[PDB]
């Protein structure tokens, strides 16, 4: 039993964590075969980073400029390059702890676990979902820039996310491992906001599920809906829209726990109409959105890496 | 910015984790140096679950009952001996993957971080804190036995937990890595309870230092409290009592916000009086008691958003 916020062992990634160095800024690289992945904003100043020119920033540097750092080890940089917003620096060494892996692009709602680190070295990590806005909640201090976002599909690492920067409001911004950003975000120093984000039903109807095979079932009621009603309702409350695919996706959490999808939606309706008149699931007062059906399912069964 | 509930970084221990064997019984056991550390409940049959007499099962157990499997590798177990609750097998290789470690009991009110395996294989990672009534709230399901819990500071692994049980409650029990039980609870199956579990203040505190410090104050007031009548309202919510020494351990993020720990006392008061009235701290509705001052310090900035 129990329900907890649950990230992906982290092992796997912490053996492609380096430290990159260009001029007076440092932040984190993934090392990986021959090639260390990091933000190209590695190369700017302040001033650059007004209005930058990474072309032309670029075209200005030495492989010796850039400092790459693995535990005590300087590796030597060969070549560099950029890839939409993150550099990629052609090193001597093949990384030896290379996973198994892959780069994958991840849709708003899906999860994944984030490997914070500063000056190359792991500190924590922590399970994210990309909101509907693509940014990310996420806990980052300065020296954070480069840090990861992977899932694990059985011994390959999908790498998702890299870390380029925080918003005014405290939240994250970063890119694919191909370097393009999730959402409408630049990296430079000009006024960047995330637009209003909503929630993800999907995944409160997964954490729903959830609670009740933890046995937390008040919120039940007898009624079911129709997927019309129901996203007449969620859209008043800045609830994503829940779609046929969805419906289909919490098909075995239905089948397990006896209630239809539409059944448990009636539920979901009258918690955003009624609030939850003082009780709690899972110990939360708020509806939790970051876990998907696949993170449900897994973690109330016991699947393992 | 940002406060996340942070794990450690899994990897030196999942360098450790292994699959124990015993009769029909699978869990997991934890190999340090040439060591293999697991629940001596592993040696149980059906039969023994309710008075199992470990000693009396173990003398009647040679090495070669005992498999233990290292991803693909078989360790020779080489010797065999119980201390506590835990079972310590000699196996004849090294773990070359050994960690800088140490063995740490933990007080009520510590996190750690908790990484949940099955057939010796790593599942997932979370953070938990050791409850006021000597459980976890954990997540764990049947074969993760010998999940262990652990902080990292620096380079060196701080082992603190290993699991052996879930209470009819759905909460956790487990012991050190010297195989003594946290709370009165034993490793047999029969009826126990946990005690009625309270909130951990000092933890709660620091929490609120740290929306303060993320640029949050509309839950501050003018007013200060005594120790003592602080300590007479919080106990009627089910709060831990605050001690002097909780005060002082609050001292440094009392220096850095610039409001004393008994200001900060009156803000609970306050709060468990009236609820947040639709507002969250940091993100959250209720009052969060799993980070610790030293957890809170670790994740934040060093200066706060005024
Ligand atoms: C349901 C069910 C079991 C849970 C366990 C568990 N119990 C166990 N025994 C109780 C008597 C033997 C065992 C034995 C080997 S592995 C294991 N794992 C641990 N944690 C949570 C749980 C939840
Ligand atoms: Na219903």
Not at 27 to 32: E, K
Not at 47 to 74: C, T, W
Not at 251 to 276: F, H, R, W, Y
Not at 294 to 303: A, E, K, L, T, Y
Request: a negative charge; one cysteine or more.
């Amino acid at each position: 039993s129990g329900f907890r916020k649950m990230a992906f062992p982290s092992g796997k990634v912490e053996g492609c964590m380096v430290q990159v160095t260009c001029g007076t800024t440092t932040l984190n690289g993934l090392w990986l075969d021959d090639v260390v992945y990091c933000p190209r904003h590695v190369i700017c100043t302040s001033e650059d980073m007004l209005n930058p020119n990474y072309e032309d920033l670029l075209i200005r540097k030495s492989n010796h400029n850039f400092l790459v750092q693995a535990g005590n080890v300087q590796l030597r940089v060969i070549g560099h390059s950029m890839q939409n917003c993150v550099l990629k620096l052609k090193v001597d060494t093949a990384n030896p702890k290379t996973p198994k892996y892959k780069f994958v692009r991840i849709q708003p709602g899906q999860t994944f676990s984030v490997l914070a680190c500063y000056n190359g070295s792991p500190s924590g990590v922590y399970q994210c979902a990309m909101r509907p806005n693509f940014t990310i909640k996420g806990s980052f201090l300065n020296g954070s820039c480069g840090s990861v976002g992977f899932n694990i599909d059985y011994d390959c690492v999908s790498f998702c996310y890299m870390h380029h920067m925080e918003l005014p409001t405290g939240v994250h911004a970063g890119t694919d491992l191909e370097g393009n950003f999730y959402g409408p975000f630049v990296d430079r120093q000009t006024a960047q906001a995330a637009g209003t984000d909503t929630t993800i039903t999907v995944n409160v109807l997964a954490w729903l599920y959830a609670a009740v095979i933890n046995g937390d079932r008040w919120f039940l009621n007898r009624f079911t809906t129709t997927l019309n009603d129901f996203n007449l309702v969620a859209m008043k409350y800045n609830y994503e829209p829940l779609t046929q695919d969805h419906v289909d996706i919490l098909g075995p959490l239905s089948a397990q726990t006896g209630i239809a999808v539409l059944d448990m939606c009636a539920s979901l309706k009258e918690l955003l109409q009624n609030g939850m008149n003082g009780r709690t699931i899972l110990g939360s007062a708020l509806l939790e959105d970051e876990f998907t059906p696949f993170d449900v399912v897994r973690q109330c069964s016991g699947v393992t890496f």
